[PDB]
């Protein structure tokens, strides 16, 4: 039993929730609240510890973009602050290479970043790495065979179908084939040698379509669409299945959790979250 963690998110205001879903029995565990509320963050796990990165606290008394990095120990159920990023990054994308957390893009006010920076937990230090070729907020990130992919998002003016890939040895970004659909606020993950982009927002609608990128062919292909259109969703991969969590669908905040099985090319509903929300950080032990 590994768990699916969902941290923060939004419903009326940014949230402090940390909850864990157990797909074996379909129960949600209610864990130690985040120290500061935030939505538009991203989650990742390094060395057994859950990290919540960036986002923004949209509250009734204000909203403040976050440069925060905080670390959760599931064994102690305690959150600990880490050194912060060089800049606040709301609607950030994160991926892990070689035990290091890569913070990609995101916004600070009107500033849409192309910059990228890397945290080394052994030293509690962030350093800038090569920036992307495009400013991206609401960007989806996933890592496959130590290549990090930044997919879609919004550059301040237009939503994007473009994507690009980070090569760590050379510290260089290179463009990859663009997706078939413009997607900002998609869920992005990796499963069986493909990079998936699910849902998002194209400038006109919230989306239910899903497509994947085969690294071998350099082609994006559509797979089965989700039941519910959704943007600013959480996403993870657990035991060969993609889980999508919450999101906004143009009218309400979703509590639905759908699960994609690649063998059958079908989505099904699984135990929904304890409340509807968007902009969650998600990761899996």
């Amino acid at each position, epitope marked *: 039993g590994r768990l699916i963690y969902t941290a923060g998110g*939004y419903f009326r205001q940014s949230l402090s929730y940390l909850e864990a879903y157990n797909p074996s029995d379909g129960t949600w565990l209610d864990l130690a609240d985040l120290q500061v509320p935030r*939505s*538009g963050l991203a989650g990742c796990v390094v060395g057994g510890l859950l990290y919540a990165v960036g986002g923004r606290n*949209n509250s*009734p008394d*204000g*909203n403040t973009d976050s440069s925060a990095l905080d670390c959760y120990n599931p064994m102690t159920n305690q959150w600990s602050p880490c050194a912060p990023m060089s800049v606040p990054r709301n*609607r950030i994308g994160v991926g892990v290479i070689d035990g290091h957390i890569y913070a990609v893009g995101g*916004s600070h*006010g*009107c*500033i*849409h970043h192309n910059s990228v920076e890397r945290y080394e937990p052994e030293r509690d230090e962030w350093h800038l790495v090569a920036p992307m070729l495009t400013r991206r907020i*609401g960007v989806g990130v996933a890592v496959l065979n130590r290549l990090l992919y930044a997919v879609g998002g*919004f550059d*301040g*003016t237009n939503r994007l179908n473009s994507a690009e890939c980070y090569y760590p040895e050379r510290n260089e970004w290179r463009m990859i084939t663009a997706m078939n659909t413009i997607r*900002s*606020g998609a869920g992005v993950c990796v499963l069986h040698n493909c990079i998936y982009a699910a849902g998002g*927002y194209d*400038g*006109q*609608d*919230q989306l239910n379509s899903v497509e994947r990128y085969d690294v071998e062919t350099e082609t994006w292909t559509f797979v089965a669409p989700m039941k519910h259109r959704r*943007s*600013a969703l959480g996403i993870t991969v657990h035991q060969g299945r993609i889980y999508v969590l919450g999101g*906004y*669908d*143009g*009218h*309400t*905040f979703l509590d639905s959790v759908e699960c994609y099985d690649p063998d059958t090319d079908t989505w099904s509903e699984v135990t929904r979250m304890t409340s509807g929300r*968007s*902009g969650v950080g998600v990761a899996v032990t």
Partner: single-chain antibody
Amino acid sequence: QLVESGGGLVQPGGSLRLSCAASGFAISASSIHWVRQAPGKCLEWVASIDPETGETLYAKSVAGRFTISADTSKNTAYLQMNSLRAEDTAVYYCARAYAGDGVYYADVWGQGTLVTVSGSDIQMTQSPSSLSASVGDRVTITCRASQSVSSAVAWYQQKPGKAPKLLIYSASSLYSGVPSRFSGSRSGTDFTLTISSLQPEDFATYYCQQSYSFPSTFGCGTKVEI
């Protein structure tokens, strides 16, 4: 087009729901903002919704009393206004908000609806408050931001009883449909709107807005008079 409705005359402590119905486009194809204007007063920004995340922002004066929402199936946005107070009295406008290099400007506005109920913000200082001119004049209007707003300034033209129209965004970019006689520049915190040669249809009130920092704020206008 946006057509508003849902206001009217009410008592303090009441509740109204304003409606903002879209025609010819989807209510989801942008941010939706509400802006209000008290009788003979300065524009005040009220609320916004981001259609990608669902997140709402509210002016401090209305937080926790007003709720902004979108309904995609009815193609109508709403502003639920609870615990109304006298100072809520105003013409309320809905508008689609256009992202220009990370900054939001309102490019399509509703006709406005009347609601009668009976600080650390960036100031944008507009002078003169009124200017008399003849057709053919070169006209210059100034707006000083109380602190740096980078280039996140827009200029709007408003004719009496009608919705503002976006002329310029990002300080100096002309919006489509705006004649080339209008131009805008920045010099630090001072923003100027120039009309090279005033035309009969140019007599109007002109307002500046900043959308650098929360909450967006407007100047109190310059009325260009015959």
